Amino acid sequence: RMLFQTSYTLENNGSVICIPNNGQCFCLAWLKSNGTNAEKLAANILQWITFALSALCLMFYGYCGWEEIYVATIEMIKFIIEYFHEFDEPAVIYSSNGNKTVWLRYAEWLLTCPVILIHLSNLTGLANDYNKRTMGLLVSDIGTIVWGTTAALSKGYVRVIFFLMGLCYGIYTFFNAAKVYIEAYHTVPKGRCRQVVTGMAWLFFVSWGMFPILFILGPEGFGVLSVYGSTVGHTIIDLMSKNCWGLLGHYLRVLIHEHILIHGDIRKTTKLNITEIEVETLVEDEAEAGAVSSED
Amino acid sequence: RMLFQTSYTLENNGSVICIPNNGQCFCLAWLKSNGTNAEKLAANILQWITFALSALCLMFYGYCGWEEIYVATIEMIKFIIEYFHEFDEPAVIYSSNGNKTVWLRYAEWLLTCPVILIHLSNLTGLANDYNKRTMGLLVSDIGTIVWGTTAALSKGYVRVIFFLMGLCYGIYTFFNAAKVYIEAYHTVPKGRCRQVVTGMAWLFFVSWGMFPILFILGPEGFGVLSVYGSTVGHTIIDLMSKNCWGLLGHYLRVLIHEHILIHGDIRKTTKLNITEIEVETLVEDEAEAGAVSSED
Ligand SMILES: *[C@@H]1O[C@H](CO)[C@@H](O[C@@H]2O[C@H](CO)[C@@H](O)[C@H](O)[C@H]2NC(C)=O)[C@H](O)[C@H]1NC(C)=O
Ligand SMILES: *[C@@H]1O[C@H](CO)[C@@H](O[C@@H]2O[C@H](CO)[C@@H](O)[C@H](O)[C@H]2NC(C)=O)[C@H](O)[C@H]1NC(C)=O
Ligand SMILES: CCCCCCCC/C=C/CCCCCCCC(=O)OC[C@H](O)CO
Ligand SMILES: CCCCCCCC/C=C/CCCCCCCC(=O)OC[C@H](O)CO
Ligand SMILES: *C/C=C(C)/C=C/C=C(C)/C=C/C1=C(C)CCCC1(C)C
Ligand SMILES: *C/C=C(C)/C=C/C=C(C)/C=C/C1=C(C)CCCC1(C)C
């Protein structure tokens, strides 16, 4: 298939490589297999599943709400490019140091992850403003992706350093994401809405926590997983991080909207001691408009 | 210098290239010159100037205010990498399609540009919140950089399409940036503060507008400019977009702070008809707390 040189001869007892002078770049490292047919087959099935589910999610959202639509749109464009050019440059970058870097994946993260975090910063959909903490979440997450991409493009100690820089940015992201989910839990009404927020937190930390594990295991790290193997793992946590998380987030916004139509927007101030934070909780009746504090 | 193959022999009347089987990648396209010694010399001088000015800006900011510090820090790290590894992968990506892509530049844009726009969304430094429009500015600017980077990595019609996708994201960014500067102008006190905001708008639109022009002229476009030539142009608009803009922005925040200490925080509602928008203007005396409308 390749649009780099794939035909060569070994000469002088394997010490010389001769290639056609046809303008193409050449490197042995680029011709290593991407994995077994079973790994490839598994990857093509999960991709169709993700494309189908993203199209179902899109039509379903088509009946504010813009973050779920933007991510599902990017996911669709991603699949059409994978289907036609998955291993064509620059969906995969084949670089002079011999690396294969899945630019398609990192570009998708730069497009979708900040939007997931904007959604996280307004889980109820009622806020018209965003605090200073939202800005730190976005700046830390962009840095994480930039350091991780740089680590994947590098080798040796340069890779290790940029990976560690990504991990420090990532920890700052996780820490601040955790505070938002804690605020969200004490903001939404007392019943089912707190089940969904709890569900979204589990999906978020498990799926986002898997990305650094898949990096270390993949060709970008210790080469335990092949390229197809890494694709299979990444589409699974894509389904959790994007499709399932967005579905719950959409459901949560529907429940908040139904609550406000039936009961109106009645708030109670709750205080969170763990640091001193203030949150305006939604309640069901006017017997609550007080100043409560919940110790963690 | 290179850590790709630079030694080869032409055989069979220039129709065959033979190289050592030493594990290195090889491509003729990678060995094209980066430019003249004069272009290189010009580029090394402007880089020292930018590193020195970024260090002066850092010490000066060292006497909220975090956006100027974050950008000046990234600029410093950028210079230490340029000084030691400017043309080493992956500061430059040498890819299988023959392209040289200055990943160092695009990674810096992903780190600094969103932070410049967060600063723009709070020019006075008094806001504790950010509106919905801030989020569209950040999401549009990230997309611009992602499409532009993808265009630089591509060739032929693929490059043209991703460039046009960047231009559409970019126009949305410029349009929304223009509204913010219009709001900022009618928000800050009537004298010198409105001169600085006007100055920051000119710096912003001229320096940001030059990036797509330098893309079209550089190796990523029609190859009018060489690599050193493109570096020289980019450090100039870096000085305008980052160093000079941040300096004015810091100065503006100092003037707003002095105004509020001497006069207190007294606001007047002004309305902007061009769409109907509301802005809380800072004034000097209590004879103003009314509802004015300024027709554009
Ligand atoms: C050609 O190079 C090959 C390298 O594979 C040489 O073959 C090996 O020679 C070494 C001796 O240093 C043995 O230890 C290996 O068992 C050999 N075979 C293999 C498969 O590695 C070979 O000797 C060289 N021929 C000449 C004429 O120099
Ligand atoms: C070797 O290839 C070269 C290609 O440069 C041939 O040289 C040219 O031959 C063409 C004829 O098709 C002329 O139009 C050019 O003027 C020649 N010189 C140059 C500098 O381009 C050469 O003929 C080939 N030799 C053999 C034995 O096939
Ligand atoms: C907060 C999220 C929770 C999850 C946290 C997960 C922790 C994983 C840490 C591993 C550090 C080990 C260093 C990893 C460096 C990877 C780079 C690499 O593989 O280097 C290649 C090597 O130089 C040649 O084979
Ligand atoms: C809003 C900001 C104001 C400034 C706006 C600036 C307008 C520049 C537009 C040019 C379009 C022309 C198409 C550009 C495509 C570039 C890709 C290219 O050079 O293609 C290489 C070619 O395929 C092989 O040589
Ligand atoms: C839809 C795709 C998602 C949510 C992707 C998320 C990606 C990350 C959270 C990446 C995390 C990384 C680290 C924490 C450090 C090492 C480098 C990364 C980029 C793999
Ligand atoms: C400090 C560096 C700055 C402010 C860089 C800004 C970069 C841009 C505004 C890039 C703009 C582009 C377009 C509008 C479309 C084509 C692709 C880009 C990325 C060159």
DSSP A28-80: SGGGS----HHHHHHHHHHHHHHHHHHHHHHHHHT---HHHHHHHHHHHHHHH
The conformation of residue A142, written as its DSSP 8-state character, comes to H
Interface test with B, best of A18, A21, A88, A96 (most B CBs within 10 A): A96
Q: Are B118 and A135 in contact (CB under 8 A)?
A: yes
Q: Are B43 and B231 in contact (CB under 8 A)?
A: yes
For residue A212, give the H/E element and its range.
Answer: helix A192-217
Number of H helices and number of E strands within chain B? 8, 8
User: Would the CA dihedral through A61, A63, A64, A69 be positive or negative?
Assistant: positive
The Cβ-side half-sphere exposure at A212, using a 13 Å CA radius, reads: 18
Rounded to whole angstroms, how far apart are CA atoms A230 and B71?
Answer: 34
Phi-psi region of B209 (alpha: psi -120 to 50; beta: other; left: phi over 0): alpha
Rounded to whole angstroms, how far apart are CA atoms B152 and A145?
Answer: 19
Rounded to whole angstroms, how far apart are CA atoms A252 and B231?
Answer: 49
Helices (H), B4-102: 37-61, 66-85
Q: How many residues does chain B have?
A: 296
For residue B108, give the H/E element and its range.
Answer: helix B103-120
Q: Using alpha carbons, select from A253, A256, A276 the residue that is nearest to residue A267.
A: A256
In sequence order, the β-bridge partners of residue B279 are: B270
Rounded to whole angstroms, how far apart are CA atoms B118 and B275?
Answer: 24
Tokens for B251, please give them: 């100065």
Rounded to whole angstroms, how far apart are CA atoms B290 and A11?
Answer: 88
- Residue A198's alpha-carbon distances to A124, A171, A201, A259, B126, in angstroms, are 14, 20, 5, 18, 35
Beta strand B93-94 with B16-20: parallel, antiparallel or unpaired?
unpaired
Q: Are A70 and B140 in contact (CB under 8 A)?
A: no
Rounded to whole angstroms, how far apart are CA atoms A48 and A46?
Answer: 6
Q: Using alpha carbons, select from B139, B79, B142 the residue that is nearest to residue B109.
A: B142
Q: Using alpha carbons, select from A247, A207, A249, A240 the residue that is nearest to residue A121.
A: A249
AA letter at A51: F
For residue A277, give the H/E element and its range.
Answer: strand A276-282
**Segment 104-123 of chain B within 8 Å of chain A by CB:** 107, 110-111, 114-115, 118
Q: Are A214 and A163 in contact (CB under 8 A)?
A: no
Q: Are B25 and A98 in contact (CB under 8 A)?
A: yes
For residue A9, give the H/E element and its range.
Answer: strand A9-11
Tokens for B264, please give them: 């207190």
Angle at B225 between CA B224 and CA B228, to 5 degrees: 160
Q: Using alpha carbons, select from A136, A118, A85, A162 the residue that is nearest to residue B107.
A: A162
Rounded to whole angstroms, how far apart are CA atoms B131 and A61?
Answer: 24
Rounded to whole angstroms, how far apart are CA atoms A23 and B194?
Answer: 57
Tokens for B128, please give them: 């504790």
Is residue A166 in contact with ligand 5, taking CB distance under 6 Å?
A: yes
Contact between B96 and A129 using a beta-carbon 8 Å cutoff: no
Rounded to whole angstroms, how far apart are CA atoms A153 and B258?
Answer: 48
Q: How many residues does chain A have?
A: 296
The conformation of residue B190, written as its DSSP 8-state character, comes to S
Q: How many CB atoms lie within 10 A of CB B206?
A: 12
Angle at A149 between CA B158 and CA A67, to 5 degrees: 75
Q: Is A135 on the interface with B (CB under 8 A)?
A: yes
All residues at 6 or more sequence positions from B275 whose CB lies less than 8 Å from its CB, including other chains: none
Q: Are A53 and A72 in contact (CB under 8 A)?
A: no
Locate the chain B residue with the closest alpha carbon to A74: B143
What resolution (Å)?
2.3
Backbone φ and ψ for A191, nearest 5 degrees, come out as -90, -115
Is residue B181 in contact with ligand 4, taking CB distance under 6 Å?
A: no
Return binding residues of B for Zn(2+). Answer: 88
Q: Using alpha carbons, select from B138, B80, B68 the residue that is nearest to residue B110.
A: B138
With 0-12 / 13-18 / 19 or more C-beta atoms within 10 angstroms meaning exposed / middle / buried, residue A296 is exposed
Contact between A27 and B96 using a beta-carbon 8 Å cutoff: yes
For residue B195, give the H/E element and its range.
Answer: helix B192-217
Q: Are B79 and A111 in contact (CB under 8 A)?
A: no
Return the residue matching tokens 């695009």. Answer: B106
SS (H, E, C) B125-177: CCCCEEEHHHHHHHHHHHHHHHHHHHHHHCCHHHHHHHHHHHHHHHHHHHHHH
For residue B53, the SS3 value is helix
Rounded to whole angstroms, how far apart are CA atoms B79 and B47?
Answer: 7
The number of the ligand nearest the C-alpha atom of A155 reads 3
Tokens for A224, please give them: 């335990």
All residues at 6 or more sequence positions from B247 whose CB lies less than 8 Å from its CB, including other chains: B57
Q: Are A137 and A176 in contact (CB under 8 A)?
A: yes
* Cβ < 6 A, ligand 6 pocket: B 109, 112-113, 144-145, 148, 163, 166-167, 170, 208, 211-212, 215, 238, 241-242
**Segment 67-86 of chain A within 8 Å of chain B by CB:** 70
User: Would the CA dihedral through A84, A88, A90, A91 be positive or negative?
Assistant: positive
Nearest to B19 among A17, A95, A129 (CB): A17
